[PDB]
Amino acid sequence: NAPRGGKVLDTSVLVDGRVAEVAAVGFLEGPLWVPHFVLKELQHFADSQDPLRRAKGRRGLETLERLREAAPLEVLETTPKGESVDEKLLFLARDLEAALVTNDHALLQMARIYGVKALSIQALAQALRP
């Protein structure tokens, strides 16, 4: 299973921010999909009076805006299967035949067990370290 259906992005990678530069440099082939709930999460963070959580919801969003430059990015309103965030991302990735893009340790594990391709920005980074 080698998915040409693009990429489903989670909160962690948008908060990390680097996915945006990886796309622009040509190593993140689209289409790029973000679930409605991920966005719902970045604004629940953005709506914080706590500057730390504010400044990271704010950050996820800027990453989105910058991605909508490198590539077609589209928000998925349509998510039917699954109860937890991790579970919804997985069936989402199988449905579109797209890879997950996430730094999340538990989600990367669930994906190996499901056999869903998942791309980790941190694993990419640690491969290219000096």
Over the window 37 to 76, marking each residue x when it contacts a second copy by CB under 8 A and - when it does not, the resulting string is: -------------------x--x-----------xx----
Given candidates 53, 54, 66, 117, which one binds a second copy under the rule CB under 8 A? 117
Is 86 one of the annotated binding-site residues? yes
Count the neighbouring beta carbons within 10 Å of the beta carbon of residue 26. 9
128 binds a second copy (CB under 8 A): yes
CB of 9 or CB of 119, closer to a second copy? 119
- C-alpha separations of 72 from 31, 34, 69, 105, 107 in Å: 6, 11, 7, 27, 25
> What CA–CA distance (Å, rounded) separates 111 from 19?
19
How far does Cα 39 stand from its chain's mean position? 10
Count the neighbouring beta carbons within 10 Å of the beta carbon of residue 23. 22
**Residues annotated within a binding site for Mg(2+):** 86
Instruction: Give the residues lining the site for a second copy (CB under 8 A).
Output: 2, 4, 16-18, 21-22, 24-30, 56, 59, 71-72, 99, 117-121, 123-130
